[PDB]
Design a protein around this ligand. Structure first.
Ligand SMILES: O=C(O)[C@H]1O[C@@H](O[C@H]2[C@H](O)[C@H](O)[C@H](O[C@H]3[C@H](O)[C@H](O)[C@@H](O)O[C@@H]3C(=O)O)O[C@@H]2C(=O)O)[C@@H](O)[C@@H](O)[C@@H]1O
Length: 228
């Protein structure tokens, strides 16, 4: 028997502003369904306190997608609309099983391309330095495929305990704070000026696994998205 995330109060504010995509982008459960006790092995309350996402398969996901609150439709905002768009979370990333290589855990996405992904990464060299078992940001500065279209940053090595995140977008600039420490300040997002389709996401999006059956697993102790 699995306990529903909505059975406690911690996640109700964000569930009231999200739909869940599982196991792919096109298969969704509404905010109303989440508030109404949606539960499954893919999305359940773990140890009485974690909103836990699980997903296997290349590019599959179990992921919340920001909605207008109170039964509203899909949100779309802009990096340059004057409002500060903020996502906060507290995440326990457990040890990922063999075959899981990268798990996107928070995003800014849009109708054009992902402006930002925060992901757990098994192993990667960045700017001549090798990192392992760590949390990375990937920011798009163009629409192409080559590395010049991205800015990738080591944020923090994965910790045993919960790790806090804050993503702030204001006036075409991005700041990321991890465990209270600024790890990106004032990253330019002006390429995306006028893109009015941006939205936050969070959960587990499984990128480039080496096994189709290996299940990514991510635990949220807190998640909120706000505007101000
Ligand atoms: O050497 C590197 O830096 C790696 O980057 C690879 O190309 C990446 C690309 O930089 C980026 O991470 C992209 O991200 C996509 C993501 O995985 C999801 O599929 C979805 O969110 O869309 C993202 C996007 O298009 O922005 O994925 C590719 C990738 O192949 O994983 C390669 O250049 C490779 O050399 C290397 O692993």
């Amino acid at each position: 028997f699995l306990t529903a995330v909505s059975s406690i109060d911690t996640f109700l504010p964000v569930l009231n502003e999200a739909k869940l995509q599982w196991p792919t982008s096109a298969l969704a459960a509404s905010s109303e369904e989440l508030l109404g006790g949606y539960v499954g092995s893919q999305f359940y309350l773990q140890d009485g306190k974690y909103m836990q996402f699980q997903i296997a398969g290349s590019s599959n996901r179990c992921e919340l997608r920001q909605m207008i609150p109170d039964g509203g439709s899909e949100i779309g905002w802009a990096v340059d609309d004057g409002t500060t768009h903020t996502a906060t979370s507290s995440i326990v990333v457990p040890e990922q099983v063999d075959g899981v290589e990268e798990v996107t855990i928070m995003q800014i996405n849009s109708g054009e391309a992902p402006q930002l992904r925060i992901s757990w990464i098994r192993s990667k060299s960045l700017d001549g330095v090798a990192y392992e078992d760590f949390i990375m940001s990937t920011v798009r500065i163009g629409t192409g495929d080559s590395s010049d279209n991205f800015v990738k940053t080591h944020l923090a090595d994965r910790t045993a305990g919960a790790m806090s995140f804050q993503i702030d977008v204001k006036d075409s600039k991005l700041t990321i704070t991890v465990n209270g420490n600024v790890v990106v300040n004032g990253q330019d997002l002006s390429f995306w000026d006028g893109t009015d389709s941006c939205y936050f996401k969070a959960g587990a999006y499984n990128n480039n696994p080496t096994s189709e059956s290996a299940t990514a697993r991510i635990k949220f102790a807190a998640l909120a998205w706000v505007d101000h």
